[PDB]
Amino acid sequence: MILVNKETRVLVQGITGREGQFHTKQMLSYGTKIVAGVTPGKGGMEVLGVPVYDTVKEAVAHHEVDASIIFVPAPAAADAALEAAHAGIPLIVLITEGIPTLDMVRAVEEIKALGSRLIGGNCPGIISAEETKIGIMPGHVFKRGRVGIISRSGTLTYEAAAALSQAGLGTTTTVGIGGDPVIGTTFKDLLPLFNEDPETEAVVLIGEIGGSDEEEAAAWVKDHMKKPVVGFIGGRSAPKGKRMGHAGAIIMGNVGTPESKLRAFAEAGIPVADTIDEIVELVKKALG
Amino acid sequence: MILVNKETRVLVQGITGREGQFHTKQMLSYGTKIVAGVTPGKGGMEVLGVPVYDTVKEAVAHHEVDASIIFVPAPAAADAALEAAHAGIPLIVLITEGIPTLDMVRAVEEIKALGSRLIGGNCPGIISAEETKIGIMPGHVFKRGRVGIISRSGTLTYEAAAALSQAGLGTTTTVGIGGDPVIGTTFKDLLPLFNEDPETEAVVLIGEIGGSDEEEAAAWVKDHMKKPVVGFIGGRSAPKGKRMGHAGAIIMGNVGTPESKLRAFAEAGIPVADTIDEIVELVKKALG
Amino acid sequence: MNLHEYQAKEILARYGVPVPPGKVAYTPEEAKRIAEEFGKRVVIKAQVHVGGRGKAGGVKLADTPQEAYEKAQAILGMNIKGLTVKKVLVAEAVDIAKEYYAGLILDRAKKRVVLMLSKEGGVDIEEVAAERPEAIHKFWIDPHKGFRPFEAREMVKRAGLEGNLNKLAQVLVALYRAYEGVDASIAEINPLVVTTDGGIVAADAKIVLDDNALFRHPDLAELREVEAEHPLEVEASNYGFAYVKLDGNIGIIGNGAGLVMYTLDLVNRVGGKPANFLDIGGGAKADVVYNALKVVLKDPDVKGVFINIFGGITRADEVAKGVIRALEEGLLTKPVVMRVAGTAEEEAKKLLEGKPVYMYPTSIEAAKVTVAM
Amino acid sequence: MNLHEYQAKEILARYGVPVPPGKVAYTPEEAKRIAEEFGKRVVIKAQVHVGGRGKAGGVKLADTPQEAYEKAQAILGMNIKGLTVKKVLVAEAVDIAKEYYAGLILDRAKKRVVLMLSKEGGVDIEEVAAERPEAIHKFWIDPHKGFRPFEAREMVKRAGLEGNLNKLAQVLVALYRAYEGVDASIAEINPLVVTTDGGIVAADAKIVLDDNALFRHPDLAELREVEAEHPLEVEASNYGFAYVKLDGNIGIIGNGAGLVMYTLDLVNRVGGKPANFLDIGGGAKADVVYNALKVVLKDPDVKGVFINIFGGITRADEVAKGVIRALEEGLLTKPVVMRVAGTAEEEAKKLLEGKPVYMYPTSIEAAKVTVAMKGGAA
Numbered sequence A, B: 001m002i003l004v005n006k007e008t009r010v011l012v013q014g015i016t017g018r019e020g021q022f023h024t025k026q027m028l029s030y031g032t033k034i035v036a037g038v039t040p041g042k043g044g045m046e047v048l049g050v051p052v053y054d055t056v057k058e059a060v061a062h063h064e065v066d067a068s069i070i071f072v073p074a075p076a077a078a079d080a081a082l083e084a085a086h087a088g089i090p091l092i093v094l095i096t097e098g099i100p101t102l103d104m105v106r107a108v109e110e111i112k113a114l115g116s117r118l119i120g121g122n123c124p125g126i127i128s129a130e131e132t133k134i135g136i137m138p139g140h141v142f143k144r145g146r147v148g149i150i151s152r153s154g155t156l157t158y159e160a161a162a163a164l165s166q167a168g169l170g171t172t173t174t175v176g177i178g179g180d181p182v183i184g185t186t187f188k189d190l191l192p193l194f195n196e197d198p199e200t201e202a203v204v205l206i207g208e209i210g211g212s213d214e215e216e217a218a219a220w221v222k223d224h225m226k227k228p229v230v231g232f233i234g235g236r237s238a239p240k241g242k243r244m245g246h247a248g249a250i251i252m253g254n255v256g257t258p259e260s261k262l263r264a265f266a267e268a269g270i271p272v273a274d275t276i277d278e279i280v281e282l283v284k285k286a287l288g
Numbered sequence C: 001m002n003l004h005e006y007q008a009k010e011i012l013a014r015y016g017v018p019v020p021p022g023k024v025a026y027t028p029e030e031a032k033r034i035a036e037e038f039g040k041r042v043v044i045k046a047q048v049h050v051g052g053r054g055k056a057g058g059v060k061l062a063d064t065p066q067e068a069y070e071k072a073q074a075i076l077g078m079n080i081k082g083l084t085v086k087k088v089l090v091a092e093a094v095d096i097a098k099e100y101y102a103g104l105i106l107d108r109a110k111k112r113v114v115l116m117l118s119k120e121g122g123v124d125i126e127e128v129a130a131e132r133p134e135a136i137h138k139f140w141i142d143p144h145k146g147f148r149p150f151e152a153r154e155m156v157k158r159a160g161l162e163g164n165l166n167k168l169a170q171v172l173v174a175l176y177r178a179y180e181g182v183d184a185s186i187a188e189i190n191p192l193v194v195t196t197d198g199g200i201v202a203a204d205a206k207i208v209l210d211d212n213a214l215f216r217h218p219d220l221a222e223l224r225e226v227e228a229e230h231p232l233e234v235e236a237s238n239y240g241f242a243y244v245k246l247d248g249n250i251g252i253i254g255n256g257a258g259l260v261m262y263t264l265d266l267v268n269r270v271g272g273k274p275a276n277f278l279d280i281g282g283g284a285k286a287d288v289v290y291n292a293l294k295v296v297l298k299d300p301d302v303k304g305v306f307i308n309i310f311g312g313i314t315r316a317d318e319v320a321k322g323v324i325r326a327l328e329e330g331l332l333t334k335p336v337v338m339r340v341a342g343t344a345e346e347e348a349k350k351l352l353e354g355k356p357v358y359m360y361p362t363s364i365e366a367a368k369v370t371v372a373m
Numbered sequence D: 001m002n003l004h005e006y007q008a009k010e011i012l013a014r015y016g017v018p019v020p021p022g023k024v025a026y027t028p029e030e031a032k033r034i035a036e037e038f039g040k041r042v043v044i045k046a047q048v049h050v051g052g053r054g055k056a057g058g059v060k061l062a063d064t065p066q067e068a069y070e071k072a073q074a075i076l077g078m079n080i081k082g083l084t085v086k087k088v089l090v091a092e093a094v095d096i097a098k099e100y101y102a103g104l105i106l107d108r109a110k111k112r113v114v115l116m117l118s119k120e121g122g123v124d125i126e127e128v129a130a131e132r133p134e135a136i137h138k139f140w141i142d143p144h145k146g147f148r149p150f151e152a153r154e155m156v157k158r159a160g161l162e163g164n165l166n167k168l169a170q171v172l173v174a175l176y177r178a179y180e181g182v183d184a185s186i187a188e189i190n191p192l193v194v195t196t197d198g199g200i201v202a203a204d205a206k207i208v209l210d211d212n213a214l215f216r217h218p219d220l221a222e223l224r225e226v227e228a229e230h231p232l233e234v235e236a237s238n239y240g241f242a243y244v245k246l247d248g249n250i251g252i253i254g255n256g257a258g259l260v261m262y263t264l265d266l267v268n269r270v271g272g273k274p275a276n277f278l279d280i281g282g283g284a285k286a287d288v289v290y291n292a293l294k295v296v297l298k299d300p301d302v303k304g305v306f307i308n309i310f311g312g313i314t315r316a317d318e319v320a321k322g323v324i325r326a327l328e329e330g331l332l333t334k335p336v337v338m339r340v341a342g343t344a345e346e347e348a349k350k351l352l353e354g355k356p357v358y359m360y361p362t363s364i365e366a367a368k369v370t371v372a373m374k375g376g377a378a
C-alpha cells in the first residue's frame, strides 16, 4: 500500500451534504476511520455518529487527522482544499467535479508550497484494498493483491480492478487522480511511491487524451522503475478540440494526442493494453 | 560610509523626464558615476552623454550597475522598482512621490524577497559625503566627517547636515528613507550598517509622527548599538487623524503619536534634540 | 464555451484593449446602415465558431455602403467548413503595417497560464510551431501576482515587436486581466496589429470560456444555449450529462467519461462509427438511463443505441427498467444493444425477453453487433 | 479623501455587501417623499465627515413620512462637532439583534492590511482597543493572494460572532475586495448587524480613500473638491502644495513637510498658534512662493505669515522676488516674517527695504516675532 491504510484517520469536509453523507456512510461500512466532519454553519451537529465542526482547524483541535476528503460544491471546493492545507492536513482528497480551472491553478500552487499532497479535483479518491476507503469507489471490486493502479477515470478504473481481482492478481492501492486539466497529483508523482512499496509488484496506468502526464510518466518509468508497468489509453479514436466529458480529456492541436501517448509508452518499454482483459493479460505475463 | 561610495555605478530610470534630466545633471557635476539610463520608448537616445535603453535588462547587458535611482511618474514607479529588482540590481532608490500605498505593499514584499534593497519611495535618496550622490539633495551641505544620518524628511535633513557641517562634525552617509507609510528601508534596517562602519562615530535619527519605526529603532539601539545615537521628532504639536504633507505623517488614534516616540527614545537612552542646533550640541557632547 | 469574435472584442474592449468600432448585422440592409453610420471603409466578417474564416471567404473588405450590402449578402448564409453564417460583424477597416500574435492558454505541464507572443501574426500559430518553434516566445504567469507591465515590456522586446513599447505592453497586460476576469481558458489576439499611423489595435480576437466557471459570469452563462456546437449539449446538461456530437450513426450511452471514450474506441476499432459521446455520470438508475435515451434519440443520425454501463453496486435491471419505460412510451424506435455489468444481470435479462433490447456479457461483442445495423 | 456614509455604502453594495436601501435628501420635502416611497420606518442620518453622529443627535428614527420630514428639518443645518449638516441619508430602519465591528486599515509595522473584528460593535473602536485589546481579533492579509472565504470564516469563529457563518464571512471577503478595489486606506462596517430575522447588513459604513490613487478612480477623483475638509486644500493641490487647515492665526509657508512640521512646532512652543500647514514642495522659486502666499492669504483667520525656507542651492532673492510681486499687486495686506537660508541672502535683504517684509537669520527668532505681533491688514 501507499499513502493510506487502516490507521489513516479521516476528516470529511461537506459531510452534511447529500453526497458527503452518502459516501460517509459507505466509508464507515468499509472500515474507514472517519473521526470528524466539517461544514461551515453546521458546527455542533452530528452526522452518522461523526461530530461536525464549522472549520477544519476546530476539527483538528479535537481530533487527530491524517487525511481529509472534500465533498463541498464546486464554487467553494478550492477554498475548502486551501483551508485543509492551511490546517496542516498532509493528504487532501478533492472529489468535487466542476471546479473552475483557474481556482485550481491558484490552489494547487499554494497547497503544494505548504507541504500537503492534493489528490483531485474531479476524482473518485484513493483506496487501499481491505485497509481503508477514502473516496466514492465501490469497495467490492478491490480484492487485496499485487497490483497498484493510477487512473484519470472512475468507472473504467473499477472495471479494471474487478478484472484484476477476478484473475487472482488483486490490487494494492488504487488512486483516481482526476479528470481535470489541472490536478494536484500526477502519475509521475505517485510512481516513486509504488516503486518503493514491496507489496506492489506491478503498476497499471489508466490514462486518456489531453495534456502530457502520460508521456512524462513513461519517461520516468523508463529511467527509474524497478517493476513492471502496464498502460491503457482512453479516447484513442477521439476527435480534436472537443472535451470528452472530463474537463481534461481534450486534444489541443499538437498537445494531448493518443498517438503521442502510445509512442511514449513504447519507447519506455511499457506495454499498452487495448482492452480491460489485455490489462490482466499483460500484468500476468510480466509477473511470470 | 555605508551602501554607496565613489565606485558605485549608477543607472537612472526616468532619465529623459524633467526631474530625471535635472538631477542627472546635478549628480554628474557632483561626481556620481551615472553609466546608463532607462526610459521605455526612448531606447537609443542619449541624455547628458548617458546612453538610454528601453529596459533595465538591456541597460545592464551593456553596463555594470550597482544601483538604480528612479524618477518615473507615480503611476508607473512601483513597476519600475520591480523591473530593477528583477534585473538583479542590488540597491534601488525610489524618489517618486505619490505612489499608491497598495502598489508599495505589493512591491516592497516582492523586491525584498528578491534580495534587492529598496530605499523609498517619496524620498530624497542617499549621499556619501564627497564620494557619491544618488538623489536630489544639495551636495554642498554635506561636508565629509563623522556623523551618519537617517531621515524621514528632505529639506529638514539638509538643514541638520548643514549645521553638522558648519560645526566641524561633518557627515558620513545620509539616507532619506522617505515620507511614505510603506517604505523599503526603515531606521532599524540601516542602524546595523552604521553600527559596523568605523568612519561613523554617531548617528542622528530624524523622525516624525506616524507608525512605529522610531520606537522599533529605539529598542534596537538600546540592545545593540555600540556608538551614540541622537533623535529628533517632527510634528510634536500635530493634530490627530490628519496627514501632514507626507503620506506617512499621520497619527491614527493610538498609533504614531509623538509622545510614544519621545518615551521610547528616553527608555533607550537616546537623547532627543528639540531644535536643529540641539542636534549638533547633543552629538558634540556624546563624542567627548 | 465558444464566443464569437464580436463577443470576444466586447470583453477585450471592456478591459482596455483597443478594438476597431464594429456592430453585428443579421441582414444586408443592417450591414449597409452600419457602413453608412461609420462613413468609411469597413470589413464584413462571418461570425462562426471556427478559424480560417479569411481563407474560406468569410472576411471581405467594403469601401462603400452598397459594397457592404453586397458583401454581407454574399457571406450571410454561406458555409464555412461545416458552419452556416447567421450574422456578420461590420467593422471599420484598419490600415495594417504589422501583424503580431498574442495568445494565452493553460500550460498543463507547468500548471500555469502561458503567454505566447510572436512577430509572425495573421497566420496559423500552429504552423509556426513547426516551421520555427523558435519564433514563439513564452512567459508563464504567476497565478497570484498576475502579469505586470514590466514583464509585458520584456516580452515585447524578447519577441522583437516593433511599435510603441508601452502601448504594446499595456495590451498584453489587459489581455491577461480579461482572461482572468471572465475565466477564459483561451484568449488570443490574432492579428495584434500596428496601424500605418502607429496605433495598436486588436484586429481579431478569440476567447473560449471555462464552462466550470459560468456560474460566476451570469451575463455569459446566458449565451450557453446559442453558442452550443449542438442543441443536444444543452438538454444533456439539464440532467448533468456531458454530450458531444460526432459524425456517425451509432448512439452511445455510458456511465463515466473514461468508459465512454473506451466504448467509442471499441466501436471505431471494429468498423463502427459513433454518432455521439454521452456520459450520464457516475450513477445509472432508471430515470437517468431513460433521460439519456431521450436525449440521444432526438438525433436524426442515430441508427441504433449502444448502452455500455458498469454499475458494480447499482443493479442491472435499473438500466433495463429505464429502457423499458422508454420503449413503452413509443420513444425507442431504434434497436438498442447493451452491456450492463452489475448485480442481478439475469433478472435484468428476463425483463428484456422478446423486446428489441439485447444484452451481452462482453463490451466488444455488443460493439460488433451494433456495427451491423 | 473622506467619503460620506452614503458614498461608502454605494461602494460596499457594488462589491456585494448587503446594505439597507437609502437615498440622500437635501430638504425635508425630499426626506418625506423618500419615506413615502419606502413605506416603512426609516432613519434620518446626518452626512458629515466625523464620527459620533449618533451621540451628537444626527441620527434619528422616523416611523412616518411626517416624522421623516420633521427629523430631516431638525438635522439639516445642525452642527455636529464643528461641521454643518448639508444633507441627510434617509434609510430603511433595520431591526437589530446583534452589533459587530469589522474594519480594515494598514498596519504599518507589518506592512500589511489588517482586518480587525470584534463582538463589541456600535461602539468607538479606539475605546475598545485601549480598554480591552483582547476583544479585538486581527488577521494580516496577504498582499497578493488577498482575503479568502476560509480565512474569513476562521476569523468569524475566532471572534465568536453569532449568526450565519457563511454570510458573515462573505461580507468580510467583499469588504476587502472593496478596499482594494477603490484603493481605500480605511474601510469599516460599524455596526455590522445581524437583524432579528437573522439577516446580515452593513448598517453603517466608513471609507477613506488613498489620495495617491485617485488618478485611477476618475469616478471618485471627481468628489475631491466637495469632500475637502477645507476649500484651500484644492487650490493648494493645483500648484502641487499640501495644505492643512489648523485653528490659529499665523499663516505658515515652508518647503518640505518635515521642515513645516518643525516650523509649526517652533511657533506653538513660543506661544503662537498656527493657522495652517503648507508645504510648497522641494523647490522655492519666485512663482511658487507667490502662489503659496496667494493661497494662504485667502484665509480670513490669517493675521500674518511666517515663511520658513531652506533653499541651499536656490537663491534667497527668489523668495523675496515672489513676496514682492505679491505685495506690489495689493495681495499682501498682512505682515510677513521670513527665515530664508541659501545663497545671496544679503542681496535678498536689500530687496525688502521699505517693504513690510522682515528677514531674520534664525527660525526661532522669526517664530517669536510673529507670535507677539497683532496682525490685521496694514
Ligand SMILES: Nc1nc2c(ncn2[C@@H]2O[C@H](COP(=O)(O)OP(=O)(O)O)[C@@H](O)[C@H]2O)c(=O)[nH]1
Pocket (backbone or CB within 6 Å): C020, C043, C045, C050, C051, C052, C053, C054, C055, C059, C092, C093, C094, C095, C096, C099, C122, C123, C190, C191, C203, C204, C205
Ligand atoms: N486591412 C485590414 N485587414 C483585415 C482587417 N480585419 C481583418 N483583416 C485581415 O483578414 C484576415 C482574416 O481576418 P481574421 O479576423 O483574423 O479571420 P480568421 O481567418 O478567422 O483568423 C486577417 O489575418 C487580416 O490580415 C482590417 O480591419 N483591415
Ligand SMILES: Nc1nc2c(ncn2[C@@H]2O[C@H](COP(=O)(O)OP(=O)(O)O)[C@@H](O)[C@H]2O)c(=O)[nH]1
Pocket (backbone or CB within 6 Å): D043, D045, D050, D051, D052, D053, D054, D055, D059, D092, D093, D094, D095, D096, D099, D122, D123, D190, D191, D203, D204
Ligand atoms: N434600530 C436602529 N438603530 C440604528 C440604525 N442605524 C443606526 N443605528 C444606531 O445608531 C448608532 C450610530 O449611528 P451610525 O450609523 O453608526 O452613525 P455614527 O454616529 O457616526 O456612529 C449605532 O450605534 C446604531 O446602533 C437603524 O436603522 N435602526
Ligand SMILES: [Mn+2]
Pocket (backbone or CB within 6 Å): C122, C190, C191, C204
Ligand atoms: Mn485571425
Ligand SMILES: [Mn+2]
Pocket (backbone or CB within 6 Å): D122, D190, D191, D204
Ligand atoms: Mn457607526
